[PDB]
Amino acid sequence: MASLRDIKTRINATKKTSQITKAMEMVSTSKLNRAEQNAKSFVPYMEKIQEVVANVA
Amino acid sequence: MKTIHVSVVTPDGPVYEDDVEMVSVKAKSELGILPGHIPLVAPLEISAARLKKGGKIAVSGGFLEVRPDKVTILAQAAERAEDIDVLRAKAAKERAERRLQSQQDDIDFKRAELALKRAMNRLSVAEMK
Amino acid sequence: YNHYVSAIQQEVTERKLLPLTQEEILDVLLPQYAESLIYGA
Numbered sequence: 001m002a003s004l005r006d007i008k009t010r011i012n013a014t015k016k017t018s019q020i021t022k023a024m025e026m027v028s029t030s031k032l033n034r035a036e037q038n039a040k041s042f043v044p045y046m047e048k049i050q051e052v053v054a055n056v057a
Numbered sequence: 058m059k060t061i062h063v064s065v066v067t068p069d070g071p072v073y074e075d076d077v078e079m080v081s082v083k084a085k086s087e088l089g090i091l092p093g094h095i096p097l098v099a100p101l102e103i104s105a106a107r108l109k110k111g112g113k114i115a116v117s118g119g120f121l122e123v124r125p126d127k128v129t130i131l132a133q134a135a136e137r138a139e140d141i142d143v144l145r146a147k148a149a150k151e152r153a154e155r156r157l158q159s160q161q162d163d164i165d166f167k168r169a170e171l172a173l174k175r176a177m178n179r180l181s182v183a184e185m186k
Numbered sequence: 187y188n189h190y191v192s193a194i195q196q197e198v199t200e201r202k203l204l205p206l207t208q209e210e211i212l213d214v215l216l217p218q219y220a221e222s223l224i225y226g227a
Contacts, residue, residue, distance in 0.1 A: 099208060
């Protein structure tokens with residue numbers, strides 16, 4: 001049962017889908033290792049707040 | 058000339074950090090900070106911090122960590138800026154919409170959510186197969 | 187929100203905030219301690 005040229009349409013559709021998918025994975029993997037950059041860059045400010053917020057008796 | 062290390066950090070990361078002879082900030086109410094100043098914590102003003110090494114930082118909000126060996130300037134927003142403050146606003150300006158201009162962030166994902174629904178359009182499975 | 191441990195593995199949380207952790211300037215730490223947390227979040 002079914003087609004052939006209707007089985008090609010599906011393959012290629014799937015393929016171009018995987019492409020677009022894996023694209024964004026790598027793309028969103030490129031946005032993890034920039035989360036640190038703005039994660040780090042905030043490390044100091046936090047330290048020098050609890051150090052201030054040491055809390056009077 | 059004994060020195061007191063001075064740091065300025067913001068939510069975006071360090072700004073100015075080097076050993077100087079004195080930091081003069083305007084606390085709400087001047088205060089000269091000299092090497093060997095006792096532990097004191099005080100809220101800043103929207104003013105500038107003058108770090109005097111040879112001689113002659115814009116801060117918007119934040120405290121002062123005064124430690125005998127170091128001076129930390131917490132700032133919500135700080136940009137090495139001129140005498141005038143009505144600059145840090147300038148930087149708070151040219152950065153504002155130039156962060157809204159980041160529609161591309163949005164629009165790629167559109168084009169992506171687009172492609173993802175165009176390869177799915179051919180119903181990548183017709184009654185399976 | 188969701189926390190972050192090591193690349194993609196994560197879990198949802200309720201850390202809380204607006205309670206229990208010149209001189210006496212809290213008018214300036216209360217604010218700069220929330221701005222700080224909502225950001226880190």
